[PDB]
Amino acid sequence: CDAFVGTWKLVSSENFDDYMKEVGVGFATRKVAGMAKPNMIISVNGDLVTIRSESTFKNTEISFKLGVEFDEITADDRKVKSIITLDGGALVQVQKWDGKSTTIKRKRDGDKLVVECVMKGVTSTRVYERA
Amino acid sequence: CDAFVGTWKLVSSENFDDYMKEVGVGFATRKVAGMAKPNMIISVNGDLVTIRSESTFKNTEISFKLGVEFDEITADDRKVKSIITLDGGALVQVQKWDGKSTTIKRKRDGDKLVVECVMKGVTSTRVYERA
Ligand SMILES: [Cl-]
Ligand SMILES: [Cl-]
């Protein structure tokens, strides 16, 4: 997780709005959430990994430890139980709620941070780049 | 809780710059902090409680459960071990780190929300009101 430390800006974004409706995000919200250009900020402090996302939509932040599951209240106001792991080079976050489950993958490609979000079939791709 | 849920704006501060130097914050960052008028958002989602602070300098979103110890990265970037309780009608937060310890009281007083911060002898006082 040392290769993720830094402030990142949103460059591209595709299949996002399609991903939202699958999770169960409201119409009016998907239009404002997807309309935003977040500023993902990852930083570590010992065993703690913080992922602060300052967007024009919401302002979320999650501090955690690898493997140890924690309570997370998503931006779209959804109480989920998340668990982030360093599976094969990437930061794989699995969010469980109401039996349902989604997966946020944060991989790396050269000078970019690629975020993948799966919600059964539909998978979004949002590319980031050092601010 | 529930008597804290809602949005609060800062309307006054006393001994904040005096209290921060005791915590150990740097002159530079101590000046920008006291110059900020943060908005403290407080919500509840089940047994989980979220207190968020939004201002011109540093944004924090601390989600927690009453009486259960949790890891927190303070705005001034300290790796503290916090624990919040409903003590005598007040949301009492205690931050332990490096042997030191600071207490943050969050009580209500009519239409106001009083925040008292104790660090040894000094005590910062900041009041908020519904947005
Ligand atoms: Cl790089
Ligand atoms: Cl009231």
Side-chain angles (χ1 to χ4, degrees), chain B residues 3 8 108 110-112 130:
Chain B
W8 313 76
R108 296 274 282 117
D111 57 338
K112 306 304 184 305
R130 300 185 155 293

Side-chain angles (χ1 to χ4, degrees), chain B residues 49-75:
Chain B
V49 194
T50 308
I51 296 178
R52 181 143 42 83
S53 177
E54 289 169 336
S55 55
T56 67
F57 122 104
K58 285 280 169 50
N59 289 190
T60 61
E61 176 180 67
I62 272 63
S63 301
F64 61 93
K65 293 190 178 191
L66 262 47
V68 176
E69 187 187 66
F70 66 105
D71 279 300
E72 178 190 11
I73 291 297
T74 69

Side-chain angles (χ1 to χ4, degrees), chain B residues 78-90:
Chain B
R78 276 174 295 144
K79 189 194 172 186
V80 298
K81 203 65 70 73
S82 287
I83 202 288
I84 300 177
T85 63
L86 233 190
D87 198 35

Side-chain angles (χ1 to χ4, degrees), chain B residues 8 15 25-26 33 54 79 95 101 118:
Chain B
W8 313 76
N15 290 43
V25 308
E54 289 169 336
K79 189 194 172 186
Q95 299 182 319
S101 177
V118 194

Side-chain angles (χ1 to χ4, degrees), chain A residues 47-96:
Chain A
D47 33 286
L48 261 199
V49 182
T50 315
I51 299 180
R52 172 67 192 184
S53 170
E54 299 182 326
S55 60
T56 53
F57 165 56
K58 195 75 178 297
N59 270 348
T60 202
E61 180 201 86
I62 60 176
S63 290
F64 60 80
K65 296 185 188 185
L66 278 47
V68 193
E69 79 162 359
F70 60 97
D71 290 307
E72 182 192 14
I73 170 54
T74 71
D76 60 301
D77 289 293
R78 176 167 45 97
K79 192 183 180 296
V80 292
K81 269 184 170 299
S82 300
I83 183 172
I84 301 187
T85 66
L86 224 185
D87 199 285
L91 287 181
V92 192
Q93 177 189 181
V94 182
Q95 294 180 328
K96 299 164 250 59

